[PDB]
A paper describes a structure:
Multifunctional autoprocessing repeats-in-toxin ([name]) toxins, secreted by multiple Gram-negative bacteria, are primary virulence factors that promote initial colonization, dissemination, and lethality in a wide range of hosts, including humans. By doing this, the clinical strain [name] MO6-24/O generates a [name] toxin (MARTXVv) containing four effectors, which are arranged in the following order: domain of unknown function in the first position (DUF1), the Rho inactivation domain ([name]), the α/β hydrolase domain (ABH), and a Makes caterpillars floppy-like effector (MCF) with a cysteine protease domain (CPD). Previously, we reported that DUF1 and [name] within MARTXVv are not uncoupled by activated CPD in host cells; rather, they are discharged as a duet (it is assumed that the DUF1-[name] effector module acts as a functional unit). The data show that DUF1 acts as a [name]-dependent transforming [name] domain ([name]) that disrupts NAD+ homeostasis by hijacking calmodulin.
Later, we did manage to generate crystals of DUF1-RIDCBD (residues, 1959–2374) in the absence of CaM, and determined the structure at a resolution of 3.38 Å. DUF1 within the DUF1-RIDCBD structure comprises the N-terminal domain (DUF1ND, residues 1959–2227), formed by a bundle of eight α helices (α1–α8), three 310 helices (310h1–310h3), and four short β strands (β1–β4), as well as a small lid domain (DUF1Lid, residues 2228–2264) formed by an α helix (α9), a 310 helix (310h4), and two short β strands (β5 and β6). RIDCBD composes three helices (α10−α12) and a mixed parallel and anti-parallel beta sheet (β7−β12). Of note, the two effectors are connected by α10, which forms part of the RIDCBD. Upon interaction with CaM, DUF1-RIDCBD undergoes a marked conformational change. Collectively, these data suggest that hijacking host CaM triggers marked rearrangement of the domains within DUF1-RIDCBD.
Author numbering: 1968 to 1989, 2007 to 2371
The structure:
């Protein structure tokens, strides 16, 4: 179970970043689920004839519910079938946030480009990863086939199968990339744009992952394939760490005084639809990341996992021995200064998880605690006077 450990780490980020902007029928679901059962049960693979309808219920449940526990479940349940999403050392080449025509072409370019004697590992070259994506795509196939765009909340189901399955792929690419840690080559096709999933959720994951040492030396391929062909390795990919992120906006959505400037040079080369590339500072991405993630230091230092709870928060052990739930509650759950105290406090104090209270609590510069009975252990005074 080498996938549960890392996969747990990455799903954590996606929970935080995705969740910032993210009824269903059961009759329709069980048809979905059942073709789900049918794909695997009656296709050639290590799908138990018993637990093959147990995967097309977990898979579809995990994806569309956006249960991140059922996502690691089905990652590691696939690891319980001889599957593997750890790459064979070498150098990884994740391209999976997008899909464009010229994806094969980048590989041909890349392998000859990396003249070592060794070729570049692919995320869809992996044993288990490659199963999962095929399962994803069947939902996708199921997606645009048994749902009609002009019969009400049936297009709403499709738009949600596309939005889950995209969450899935980007998740798997990150956990794959977390494996080996040998530097990645994300290949964005049209060019990283802004306002989409990849940008708000997926890109922060990679750099937030990378910072934590998990992955390293990410290079982004946005310029057309022609641009790369054969030159020194440095002209291959825009390194994340150099400068900022080379995104593409449209003239339309650009400034009013910056359209004028743009038409001073090359005065009728720009139209409404025309796409203009402008570097996003890499300083800005980092900063929204360390504010997109509560108890940001607890994650790094004390090998804990914090996540939003029904009313408070939920700290757990990083390698999940068990699905226990030492919580952390606050009088203002939304005050950052309160949070910072509780973090600073349980940081300067507890060294590990199992050394934690059932449930901690911060009320008006006072600290509660659980054990077996509420024990108030701090002081609103300049230095916290324990007990």
């Amino acid at each position: 179970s080498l996938v549960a450990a890392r996969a747990e780490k990455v799903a954590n980020l996606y929970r935080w970043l995705d969740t910032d902007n993210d009824d269903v029928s059961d009759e329709v679901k069980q048809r979905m689920i059942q073709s789900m059962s049918g794909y695997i049960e009656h296709t050639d693979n290590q799908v138990p004839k018993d637990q093959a309808e147990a995967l097309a219920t977990l898979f579809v449940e995990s994806t569309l519910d956006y249960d991140w526990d059922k996502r690691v479940e089905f990652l590691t349940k696939l690891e319980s079938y001889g599957y593997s999403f750890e790459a064979p050392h070498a150098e990884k080449s994740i391209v999976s946030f997008w899909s464009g025509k010229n994806f094969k072409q980048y590989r041909d370019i890349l392998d000859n480009a990396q003249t070592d004697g060794k070729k570049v590992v692919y995320d869809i070259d992996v044993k288990g990863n490659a199963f999962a994506i095929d399962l994803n795509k069947h939902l996708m196939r199921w997606g645009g086939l048994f749902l009609d765009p002009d019969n009400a909340e049936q297009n709403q189901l499709k738009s949600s199968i596309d939005a889950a399955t995209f969450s899935n792929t980007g998740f798997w690419s990150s956990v794959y990339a977390t494996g080996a840690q040998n530097d990645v080559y994300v290949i964005a096709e049209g060019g990283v744009r802004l306002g989409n999933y990849f940008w708000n959720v997926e890109l922060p994951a990679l750099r937030q992952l990378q910072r934590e040492g998990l992955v390293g030396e990410i290079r982004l391929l946005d310029k057309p394939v022609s641009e790369y062909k054969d030159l020194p390795a440095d002209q291959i990919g825009r390194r994340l760490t150099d400068a900022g992120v080379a995104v593409k906006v449209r003239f339309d959505a650009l400034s009013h005084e910056r359209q004028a400037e743009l038409l001073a040079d090359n005065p009728d080369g720009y139209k409404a639809d025309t796409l203009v590339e402008l570097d996003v500072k890499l300083s800005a991405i980092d900063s929204m990341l360390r504010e997109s993630l509560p108890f940001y230091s607890l994650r790094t230092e004390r090998n804990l996992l914090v996540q939003e709870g029904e009313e408070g928060f939920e700290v757990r052990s990083w390698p999940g021995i068990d699905g226990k739930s030492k919580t952390i509650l606050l009088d203002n759950p939304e005050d950052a200064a309160q949070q910072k105290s509780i973090e600073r406090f349980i940081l300067a104090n507890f060294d590990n998880f199992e050394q934690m209270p059932d449930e901690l609590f911060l009320v008006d510069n006072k600290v509660l605690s659980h054990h077996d009975g509420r024990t108030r252990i701090i002081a609103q005074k300049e230095d916290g006077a324990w007990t």
